[PDB]
Amino acid sequence: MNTVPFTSAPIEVTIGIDQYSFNVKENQPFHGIKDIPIGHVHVIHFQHADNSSMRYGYWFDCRMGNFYIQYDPKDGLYKMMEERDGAKFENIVHNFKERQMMVSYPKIDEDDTWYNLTEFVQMDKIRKIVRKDENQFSYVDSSMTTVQENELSDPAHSLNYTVINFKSREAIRPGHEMEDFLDKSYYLNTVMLQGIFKNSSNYFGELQFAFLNAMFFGNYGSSLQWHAMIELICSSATVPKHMLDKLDEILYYQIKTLPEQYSDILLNERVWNICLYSSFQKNSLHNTEKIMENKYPELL
Amino acid sequence: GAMNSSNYAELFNNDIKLFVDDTNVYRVTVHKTFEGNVATKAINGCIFTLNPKTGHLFLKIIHTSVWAGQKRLSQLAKWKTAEEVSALVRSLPKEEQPKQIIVTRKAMLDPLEVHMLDFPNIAIRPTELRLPFSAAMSIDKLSDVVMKATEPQMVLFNIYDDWLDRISSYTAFSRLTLLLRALKTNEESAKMILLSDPTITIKSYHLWPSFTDEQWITIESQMRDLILTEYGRKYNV
Ligand SMILES: CN(C)S(=O)(=O)Nc1ccccc1Br
Description:
The complex is a heterodimer of chains A (about 300) and B (about 240). With about 300 residues, chain A is α+β, with helices and mostly antiparallel strands. In chain A, about 40% of the residues lie in helices and about 20% in strands. Chain A has a domain at about 115-300: Alpha Horseshoe (Serine Threonine Protein Phosphatase 5, Tetratricopeptide repeat), CATH 1.25.40.550. Chain B is of the alpha/beta class and about 240 residues long. Chain B has 2 domains: about 10-165, Nucleotidyltransferase, domain 5 (2-Layer Sandwich), CATH 3.30.420.230; about 165-235, Acyl-CoA Binding Protein, CATH 1.20.80.40. Chain B is built from 6 helices and 8 strands. Chain B has helices spanning about 75-90, 110-115, 140-150, 170-185, 185-195, 215-235; strands at about 15-20, 25-30, 40-45, 45-50, 55-60, 100-105, 125, 155-160. In chain B, strand 6 (about 100-105), helix 2 (about 110-115) and strand 7 (about 125) form a beta-alpha-beta unit. The interface of A and B includes residues 167, 168, 169 and 172 of A. N'-(2-bromophenyl)-N,N-dimethylsulfuric diamide (W1I) binds near residues 5, 7, 70, 83 and 92 of chain A. Chain B: It is found in: Nucleus. Chain B: This is Pre-mRNA-splicing factor 8. Chain A: One of its GO terms (cellular component) is U5 snRNP.
């Protein structure tokens, strides 16, 4: 089990760890989070009690180093940092554990939610979308814009998601305009899967990461990216059967986890009706269609 | 953005633009079969592509052979329209290519945008105007060339005849849309109005009769009367 210890908690803050969260009061004796499952990526995120503006957080993988949080009173935020002195870090984690000033990652044993949301998400791919190569972890917040958004202003702080555009030369073969626009299989399978992502796992991983940035940080461009990657599959007549089955599972757990109250902003009516009712895949997303109809029948 | 009553004078500035109307591209007659079912039979169609400033009309004739063995013809018709407009633009010298293309029906926006990806600097625009270009097939010489065609063909016309020698393009477009609106509302009346006087003929190289200025004023009044009446005859007023 891994641990993310905290130097202190000087300001009141709601702290999230993956899909869990807890309130920490100003100067409460809080010193971090223990029992974090090894083998998955994780996200630790923050919303100050004085500013529900700017949710922000850090994607990390405990196998890549020893990480800890300390509040920076100049920049005014909880910062992730790395301690390469392993002895010193193990020592600091042991005393905090002995004084019981840490919350436990509260995973129910029956619960596969986090695995199902992050199945294909890799830290190495996250670090290519969020470019800050001197750190092993990746900062994201509510306000960061995507490359594609910037094209339509600071590139160092951008989300470098794979650009998908249905009305672009990349998507449309000369001479197959109508064919390729109505059936996007060539753009999905040749351009994107074979050409750019290399395999469907990398595609799904980016799709899952965009959704999670949309859910945890309300990141608008991430929501756009998640819907675009969905729409490209739903608008393709020819999709490997294993990809359709896995997409249905992916989307099921994403819809299941979404807050019932955020459906109005994080769900694009047009794309979902296409996937579920008009598209080629109308009959192929059985789990996703059932949970959507029973939980958000308004949207449809 | 969309073209409407407020940005109407833009049509007559010196930025080359074309209206594209696809209404008459896919045309059918509906008939009964021997078994008593219903079938369609396609007839020749046309794309109506018009420079409103100059009157140049690029009438691309759509031969029924282009539908053979195709499904979902109404959807295909929009893509075929787009393919042919794009081909037209590519055939033109750079300095004659339009800066804007205005489509008369919103369903042409995506087909045309996709076919024109090679011309990112050509704006594809809808309009809020209810233009009467579908009535182009009520102009006898245009209907005649469409129906006689035995293969795909482009025919070039000036839809304003020689009017621009005496009036502005704003006035010429207004006359054209009045004539066409009249032909759409009551074709027979409209045509009677235009041809009633046998001494006023249509030159071989023209589409409309050789009215004097005074005669165009009388004609235009008769067309307005026609349109208002049918409006009453229809809504009872
Ligand atoms: C001991 N400290 C409370 S500290 O130094 O402020 N915190 C710290 C430093 C390195 C690694 C982990 C932590 Br938490």
